[PDB]
C-alpha cells in the first residue's frame, strides 16, 4: 500500500516538479492519492490525456463520467469534479481548461489550475496545452503561480520537456 512515491522529478519551486514521462505509467509506479485528467466539459475521454487514462482504466473511467454527465450535467469551463482513479490512483481531478481554439478566454485557465488547491498532492497534465491550443510554457506558468499544493507534472514529449524546464530556469 505504497502512495505518492515520486522519484525522478525536477523541482521548479517550493511545491510544484516536473518530470519527462507519460502519465499514466507515472500513475501505476506512484499510486497517487489524486491524478488530474484535462477533462472537456461532457467528460468524453477521447484523445490526449484523456484518452490515455480512460484507456488504462479499460474504459471504468468513462463508464463512471456518462453516469456522472447523466446525473449533474456539464461541467463548467475552469470546473472540477472528483471521480474514481480506478486503477491509476484513489482519485481522479477531472479538470476542465479553457479550449483557446474555440476562443474560451485565457483567464479560465487559472479557474481550472485553482481547483489543484483542494488536494495536499497531485499528479497532473498541463491543462489546454493539447488541443485546446494554449502555450504550454504559459499553462506552467498560470500552474506554478496558482497552484499552492504539491503538484508533480508529467510532460510526455522529450524535446516540449526541454523547451519548458530550459524557459522556465533561465527566466524566474
Known sequence: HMVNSFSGYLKLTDNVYIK???????????????????????????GGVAGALNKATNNAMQVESDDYIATNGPLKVGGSCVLSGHNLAKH??????????????????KSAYENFNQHEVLLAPLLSAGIF?????????????????????????????????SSFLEMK
Open 133 to 165: 491550443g494554449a502555450d504550454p510554457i504559459h499553462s506552467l506558468r498560470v500552474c506554478v503561480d496558482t497552484v499552492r499544493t504539491n503538484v508533480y507534472l508529467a510532460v510526455f514529449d522529450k524535446n516540449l520537456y526541454d523547451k519548458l524546464v
Open 92 to 109: 481522479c481531478l477531472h479538470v476542465v481548461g479553457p479550449n483557446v481554439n474555440k476562443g474560451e478566454d485565457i483567464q479560465l485557465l
Open 20 to 46: 519527462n514521462a507519460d502519465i499514466v505509467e507515472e500513475a501505476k509506479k506512484v499510486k497517487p492519492t489524486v491524478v488530474v485528467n484535462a477533462a472537456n466539459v461532457y467528460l468524453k475521454h477521447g
